[PDB]
Design a protein around this ligand. Sequence first.
Ligand SMILES: O=C(O)CNC(=O)C(=O)O
Ligand SMILES: [Mg+2]
Ligand code: NI
Ligand SMILES: [Zn+2]
Length: 331
Amino acid sequence: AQNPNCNIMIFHPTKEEFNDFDKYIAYMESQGAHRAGLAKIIPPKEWKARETYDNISEILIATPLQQVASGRAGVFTQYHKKKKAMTVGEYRHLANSKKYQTPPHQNFEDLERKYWKNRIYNSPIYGADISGSLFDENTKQWNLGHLGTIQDLLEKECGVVIEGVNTPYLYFGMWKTTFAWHTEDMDLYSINYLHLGEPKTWYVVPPEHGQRLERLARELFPGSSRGCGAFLRHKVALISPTVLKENGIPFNRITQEAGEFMVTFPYGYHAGFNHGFNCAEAINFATPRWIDYGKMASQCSCGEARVTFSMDAFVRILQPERYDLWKRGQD
Ligand SMILES: O=C(O)CNC(=O)C(=O)O
Ligand SMILES: [Mg+2]
Ligand code: NI
Ligand SMILES: [Zn+2]
């Protein structure tokens, strides 16, 4: 078995290997990459996402989210308070202000220490989940707006044609902006490209050990667990590496820098934080190997998770027994 310790693997495809996206994902899996839940892909030196980032300031962040924490430093939830709209230029200025800017630090490890010590005492503002793309239309390789759609994959594998669409999302971050522990909708893959700015630190639990994280989460968030049998789908709970280690949960960590891709694999729980002002683009995707994960994915039916239009068909076709309860949660 390849990669039996479930380490995060880093790949350096050549320009020729960067042509065929599906083929390269299957290659990475042949080397055991998926066992970690997360892989890094460094593009060939010849590649670029677009020519420059000099003209992005007028993008609108219609609903910036202030991420307010509750709990203790290593075990907390966050809720998202909606703020007034602002442009990317306005948000960048805000991220760089004395109130929000990255503190002085020695290296990524020192910054990570500072994050976990101090995150809860601040409420950073995240421009998350903005439909759109920063890839140039002429970028033919690993262009996250030109991937094969999940609806087409389901139709290719299973023969059933379904409604729905699959488009990317932009994320504008600042210091301490946080992504809570989660797997993707329907335990899909994700791919995330860090277009510009400061790094993003990731934590990940191997898919084969995801239920260990779920059992810890139920212990640490016991009211939430009584409320919903899949409350990590709410995407609000944080648990620090120190607490994971104290409880014997297998995990790994890595820092993504600008110009790098990360892929999360089906049922790979992940969480993390941004180091300073940045912009990422991410989208969900599927492969043949996903289908079995999609059929077994947990679902939130309590009403909290509320998701896209296109998840309806995935539940309806892959999980018909669960469909009626899940759809009630959507309505
Ligand atoms: O970058 C973020 O805030 C969150 N991203 C992801 O969870 C992802 O790409 O799957
Ligand atoms: Mg602009
Ligand atoms: Ni994710
Ligand atoms: Zn729920």
